[PDB]
Structure formats: structure tokens, C-alpha cells
Amino acid sequence: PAGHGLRSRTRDLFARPFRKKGYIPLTTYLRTYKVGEHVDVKVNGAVHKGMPHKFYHGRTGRVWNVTKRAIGVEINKQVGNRIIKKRIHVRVEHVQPSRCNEEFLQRKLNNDKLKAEAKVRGEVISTKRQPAGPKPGFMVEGTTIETVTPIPYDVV
Amino acid sequence: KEKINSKRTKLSAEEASKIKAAGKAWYQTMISDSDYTEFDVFSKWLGV
Amino acid sequence: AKSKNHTAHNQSYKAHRNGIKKPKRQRQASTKGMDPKFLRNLRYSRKHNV
Amino acid sequence: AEQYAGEYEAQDKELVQLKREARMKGGFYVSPEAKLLFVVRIRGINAMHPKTKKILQLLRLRQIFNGVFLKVNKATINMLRRVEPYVAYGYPNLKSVR
Amino acid sequence: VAFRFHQYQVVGRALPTPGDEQPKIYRMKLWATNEVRAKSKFWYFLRKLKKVKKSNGQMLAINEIFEKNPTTIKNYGIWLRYQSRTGYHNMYKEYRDTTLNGAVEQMYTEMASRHRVRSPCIQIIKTATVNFKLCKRDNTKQFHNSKIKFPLVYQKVRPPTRKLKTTYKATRPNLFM
RNA sequence: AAACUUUAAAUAGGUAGGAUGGCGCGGCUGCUUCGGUGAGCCGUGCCAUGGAAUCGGGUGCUCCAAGUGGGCCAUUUUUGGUAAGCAGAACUGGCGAUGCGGGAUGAACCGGAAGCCGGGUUACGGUGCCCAACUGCGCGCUAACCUAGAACCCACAAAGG
RNA sequence: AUCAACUAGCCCCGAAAAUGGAUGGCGCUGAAGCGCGCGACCCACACCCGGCCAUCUGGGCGAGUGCCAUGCCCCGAUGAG
Ligand SMILES: [Mg+2]
Ligand SMILES: [Mg+2]
Ligand SMILES: [Mg+2]
Ligand SMILES: [Mg+2]
Ligand SMILES: [Mg+2]
Ligand SMILES: [Mg+2]
Ligand SMILES: [Mg+2]
Ligand SMILES: [Mg+2]
Ligand SMILES: [Mg+2]
Ligand SMILES: [Mg+2]
Ligand SMILES: [Mg+2]
Ligand SMILES: [Mg+2]
């Protein structure tokens, strides 16, 4: 309304990708959701029911209520000077589970394992990542060194 | 002040020779210049 | 005298000068709107805890 | 303080020793880059991009001619790359720091 | 004393990657005003020639080169690539100076004067000593003669230090060459 | 090819980076399943070196209420227009509400935002006189018998000889 | 010894408006123009130290020799409208 209906400006947002038109692979239906997982809303052109508004294509949020044929997602929309946790129900064809927390949930166990292994021995460790910092010195075994000089200008 | 043994024998002649040879080798490779047998059009301008 | 005017100029400033207020994340997240078939069960169990 | 002076001196001499050693062995030694930066702000607080304002509030450079000590890590150096026209920074040496 | 340029040689290579665990090595001879500017020029030429960027590169060595005999005059040639207002061109320049380091200064000054080309627009393709009896430019060639003699057509009258200089002086100065 | 696209950037967008986490035990369900099967909750016991960098008290919660709702300029993206010191948008900053140093003079161009003083040093911009600072040290080109030329915006010059 | 083309710096031709007239003015010509530099130097209410005012923050002061306690003392930052 007010100049723009539900599916405006989506000449390309809602299209299928090239040579991925037609059928829905069964995996998008047999991936199962539980309340709390982080899922990515990406609308699917061909399934017209339960569709989310074009704003929500390409966001992530936590499932908050799961029903038959429908997932309840709870994502942040920024309006004014505040963040509203909007709650939408999207049909399962429009959501894919996210791999944002893949590394997190792997690393959680990878950490608790080393805190256990440290409790084994001298019970001091530090299970933190550090961003790539200064690289230490080393010798370079002198090889053939290629001299490069700026090229004279051939107009052609 | 009165010319005491101020810095005397510190290293021998074979060592002070190989050090000088390694320095001069690095100098040769440090001032080494390019072949310029690549640019078949600016040969005569570059002189080679 | 063109009574139709529109900008978003200065609106990001007004938004952000007092922060973009995120809501306080909550222990015991709200259930209103959830699946009534799920919530009736959830209530009834808590009725018959011991 | 005694053994700090001792180890400073040892590190400074050791770098020279490895550089000559690598040269005589034929190749060359590559110094292990600076772990620390001194960053001093060189522009006034007027007409700044708001991202730049926040970056400088985190780097703690909130007034012209402030100078702060910073670890070199990828997060920090790519945070400096954003406010680079506003800062002058480099690798302080022992006299500078003391 | 102080020289506005210094001929460094910078040696660098791309970062280690799983294939090609010893990436190949590049050497260059760059003029600049100091280390950091020579380095920043080196990454320029290995990012427009050899497809390597500072992020995805690593610098191993930088030496400052000096001159062999600062006491003798050496006919220098510089082959240089420059940007005019409407294109690029290629120049050859012959100088007489005691050092290549001074010749480069003289050459930036000549390109800033004869052509209003600034430093950010000039590249020194090849530098070399083009010894006498093989020089090409007339202004170089005309100083290749012993038994040379010329008087000084231009000689500033000027007190030896700023102290000895006053505003009124009784006698019109005697200038003679 | 603005109302064409296989491909497809950069900047900008979203989410996660633990104490609001997990595992054991024994319980509820009127949901779920062929079914202790799951889903969730409930009680209890254990763990969990604080889970990238940096920074730092917070709108965290609420009440009452003011003024405002004529905008304008700039760098960049951009629609109409031949264009406009024009009309309409996008991101940010400025003026409006703001002095001060520079651009001779200027609301928004450059520097920079301030209690009242003493001392030092600078930014922008300059050092021939007006006018505080060099008729400084160097190297080139210009000789204008048209008002040669001489500051980011900025007070233009074109095709062409 | 030289011939031709191309190219690009400054200058010139291209280049015309009405009050007298504006590189800000005078003037400037191994510049006081143009391009690049080097040593210093001059200049803001900007940065630093120091004194003072105020606001804010944080402290001290009772078997009281005890105080406009609504006070005094100390520390720190800040100051456009
Ligand atoms: Mg609307
Ligand atoms: Mg309506
Ligand atoms: Mg309406
Ligand atoms: Mg698409
Ligand atoms: Mg329908
Ligand atoms: Mg209006
Ligand atoms: Mg394509
Ligand atoms: Mg956008
Ligand atoms: Mg992202
Ligand atoms: Mg003063
Ligand atoms: Mg004066
Ligand atoms: Mg108070």
C-alpha cells in the first residue's frame, strides 16, 4: 500500500537463478528445524505461499516457533531509533539453515576438549584465537633473484 | 690518549677475508642490472 | 512554495545520536503467539509436575 | 631493570649477528616485523566521517596530537587503514618508549 | 652532504601458499627519498608488473646503495618513462655529475622544469654510466675536452655571510669577468 | 540497452564468536511416535581459565514537557532541463545556532571549534612594500610592440594555427 | 654537416561592451612569473606547561581540640551555542 504493494521492486530479487528453475530438491524439505537454530531467510520464487516480504530476503534469525509447513523466524528490523524483533512465519521452502555457527559449535567442543586435557596435566591453558600478527624472522636461502624494470612505453 | 693496545687483534685474516668476499658478493648482486634482452622494440633506444 | 519536500538527510544522525536501542535480551523468552497445540501441552505438564 | 637492560642489549646485538650470519651464508635475514605501533592523530575534530569518529574513539585518539601505543594485529591494522588520513604512526624504538 | 634521493634495491616475494611453497623472488632498483617511500614504490611496480599486492606479498630485504667514487665526474644516462598532460612518452637524458644520486635530482628538476612533470608521474626505466666518447647529447658532449676554459658570465655579488651585508653602500660594485 | 542479460565487482547489509553453555540422573504432558519414539518442560548433581582485537558505565526503565516540522552549500552517485547561483532524490559533513587563523573582500572552500591570562610550538597560508617572516640557497623555461603571469572552490576560455 | 615528420612545456594568434580600473594595490623581468627543491622563519581562541573562575566526577573531616556539614580541604577532566 501507499505506493508499493507486497512484492514490489522484485523483478530480480524473487527470480530463480539461471538453470536452477523448476523443481524443489527434497533436501530443502528434509532438513529439520528446532527452536533456537539460526536460519537464513531467502525467498523462493516458485512457492507462493507463506512467502516473506522482500525486506527479509537475505537475513538471518533464530527459529522461535516451528509448525507444520511453517517456521517462525525472529529477526531484527531497524526502524527509527530502535530495533524491532519481527516475528514472521515462512514456509520451509524459503529457509535454509545457516552455517554461521558451524565454526562456533565445532570450536566449542574443540575448546572444552583442551580444557579437559589441560586439567589432566598442569592445569593452565588459554583457549582463545588471536588474529594473525607479526611473523617472526627467518633466513632466505638465496635463490635466483629476478630483476624487473618498468616497461618503456609502446604507444601501440 | 697514550696509544695503548686500543682495539687490537679481534679476528684473523681468513675470517676477515671471507667476510669481505661475502660483502662484495652481496654488493655485486645489489648493484646488478637487468639484461634487457626482452623488449625487442626498444632495443635501439635502450642501447641493448 | 513547493509543498512536497522529502529527505532522509539528518535522519541517520537523529537515529544514532541516541543509539539504535536494541531490546534487552531475555532469559525466559516470551511464548505469546506460539503454536497453541504446543503451548497447551507445555502448560498442562507444568500443571502436573511434582 | 638490570636484566631488562641486559636483554635489550642482547636482542639488538643478536639481530646484527643473524644478519651478518645470513649474508655470509649467502641468502639474507628478514627482520621480524614490529609488534607495536605509535599512532598520533594529526587532524582536527571537525568535519569527520562518523565511522572515522567511532574508530578514533576506540583507538582513543579523541583530540588532535594524542599518541597511543597499539598492538599490531590484523584487526588493528585494518582499523588504522580506515582512518589513515587522520593518523601518523610507526614503530617506536627504546628511547621513544622510555 | 645530504642527498634528496637514494638508490635502494628492494627484494620481495609473494606470501607462502600451499602450492609453490617457495614463491619466486624479485629484485628492483628504486629511487626515492627514504625507506618507506622506496618500499611503497616497490609494491607499485610489483603490483602493476608482477601481479602481487602488499597484502598478498612480503618484503624480505631493502638495501640503500651508495656510489663508488664520489670524487670523480661520471657521464650518466637515464632512460625514463613519463606522463605528459595528454599521454605518456619516453626520454633519454645525459648528465655530468659526481654521483648517480645527484644526477637523479638533476633529472627530476629538469622534468619539473622543461615539462611541468612532477615526481608522481616519472619512472626511471634504466640508469647507467654512458662514459665519454659515446655520449649523445650535445650539452654533455661539449664538456668532453681538456684545455677547456670559459669565464664566468654570471656571478652573484654577495657578502660572504649574512652579517656583512648592509642596505646602503657608498661605491657601485666593480664587476669584471 | 534505464524499463536486456549467462557472468558479475568495490562500498554498503544480516547473523555467530559461550556463564542467557553443555552432560548425567528421575519426573510431567491432555502434544508426538509403531514405540522412551521425539518435543519441550520440571527437579537435582556435575563440569565449563571467561572463549577474536580494541574501547567504555549505561536509555537500563519510566514520567512531564519545550521548541521544530520554510531549509541551504559542498565532494561524490544521480533524475528533468540546452543550461542555471534551477527543480527533485541517495551517503556524509557543514551553515543555520559559530566565534577564530587563511582564501584581499564572502554562512557553509582550506585549517580549526572557544572559560580569563602568562610562556612555548604549530595547522591552513606565506617571507618584495602595504604586512609578521628570506629581496635566502639552487636548477631550468617565459621576453608577452594584446593589460605577459602570478591561490582549492574562484570569478572561464573553445575548435584551430 | 644537414633534411622532414611527429610530440609537448612556456609564450603568441585565435581573444569584442558600454562610469575610470583592478594578479587586492604599487610594482615586478638572472623576477617579486612558472615547475621542482633545500635550510630557517612568520603566523589561530588549534597542541603543551603554568595561574585563576565554574561544572561535573571521586575522596577526607566526631566516644569531636567542634562545623555558615547548606562548610572546608585534596584529586581528575572539561568549558562553542
Ligand atoms: Mg513509502
Ligand atoms: Mg491509505
Ligand atoms: Mg495517503
Ligand atoms: Mg537475483
Ligand atoms: Mg492465493
Ligand atoms: Mg515541508
Ligand atoms: Mg559477462
Ligand atoms: Mg543501497
Ligand atoms: Mg557481512
Ligand atoms: Mg603564545
Ligand atoms: Mg615585514
Ligand atoms: Mg557537586
* B6 CB-contact burial (10 Å; exposed 0-12 / middle 13-18 / buried 19+): exposed
How far apart CA E22 and CA A95 sit, in angstroms, is: 45
Other CB atoms within 10 Å distance of the CB of residue C21: 11
Contacts of B44 (CB under 8 A, 6+ apart): none
Pairing between β-strand E25-32 and β-strand A145-147 as defined by DSSP bridges: parallel
Are residues A154 and B29, on separate chains, in Cβ contact within 8 Å?
Answer: no
The amino acid sitting at D17 is Q
> Which three cell numbers, joined as nine digits, stand for E68?
663508488
* C15 CB-contact burial (10 Å; exposed 0-12 / middle 13-18 / buried 19+): middle
Experimental method: cryo-EM
Calculate how far, in angstroms, residue A53's C-alpha sits from the geometric centre of ligand 2: 19
Q: What is the nearest nucleotide to E119, using C1' and CA?
A: G36
Binding residue ranges of C for Mg(2+): 5
Tell me if residue E56 falls in helix, strand or coil: coil
Confirm if E11 and E27 have CB atoms less than 8 A apart.
yes
Q: Which residues in chain B have their CB less than 8 angstroms from residue D20's CB? A: 19
Confirm if E158 and E115 have CB atoms less than 8 A apart.
no
Element (H, E) at A79: strand A70-79
Sign of the torsion formed by the C-alpha atoms of B19, B24, B27 and B28: negative
Element (H, E) at A115: helix A102-120
The 3-state DSSP composition of chain D as helix, strand, coil percent (nearest 5) reads 50, 20, 35
Strand arrangement, sheet containing E87-97: E87-97, E74-84, E122-129
* E104 CB-contact burial (10 Å; exposed 0-12 / middle 13-18 / buried 19+): buried
Confirm if A69 and A50 have CB atoms less than 8 A apart.
yes
Residue of A85, A91, A14 lying closest to A51 (CA atoms): A91
> Which three cell numbers, joined as nine digits, stand for C41?
501441552
Shortest CA gap D80–chain E (Å): 14
Q: How far is CA C33 from CA A26, A50, A69, C40, C41, in A?
A: 29, 17, 17, 12, 15
How far apart CA A125 and CA A119 sit, in angstroms, is: 9
Q: E44-67 b/e with 16+ CB inside 10 Å = b? A: ebbeeebebeeeebbbbbbbeeeb
Touching, B vs D (3+ Cβ pairs under 8 A) = yes
How far apart CA E158 and CA D56 sit, in angstroms, is: 53
Are residues A72 and C14, on separate chains, in Cβ contact within 8 Å?
Answer: no
How far apart CA E135 and CA E74 sit, in angstroms, is: 11
Are residues A152 and B33, on separate chains, in Cβ contact within 8 Å?
Answer: no
Calculate how far, in angstroms, residue C4's C-alpha sits from the geometric centre of ligand 6: 6
> Which three cell numbers, joined as nine digits, stand for D64?
588532535
Confirm if A98 and A119 have CB atoms less than 8 A apart.
no
> Which three cell numbers, joined as nine digits, stand for B13?
685474516
Identify from A139, A143, A149, A156 which residue to disrupt to test chain B contact, counting B C-beta atoms within 10 A and taking the largest count.
A149
Distance B38 CA to F78 C1' (A): 48
Calculate how far, in angstroms, residue E14's C-alpha sits from the geometric centre of ligand 10: 52
DSSP structural state of residue A105: H
How far apart CA D27 and CA E63 sit, in angstroms, is: 14
> How many C-alpha atoms does E12 have within 13 Å on its Cβ side?
30
Whether the CB of B42 is below 8 Å from some CB of chain E: the reply is yes
Q: How many helices (H) and strands (E) does chain E have?
A: 3, 6
How far apart CA E145 and CA A54 sit, in angstroms, is: 85
Name beta bridge partners: A147: E27
Whether the CB of A140 is below 8 Å from some CB of chain D: the reply is yes
Other CB atoms within 10 Å distance of the CB of residue E27: 20
Query: Which resolution in angstroms does this entry have?
Result: 3.4
> Which three cell numbers, joined as nine digits, stand for A63?
527459529
How far apart CA E114 and CA E107 sit, in angstroms, is: 10
Are residues A140 and D74, on separate chains, in Cβ contact within 8 Å?
Answer: no
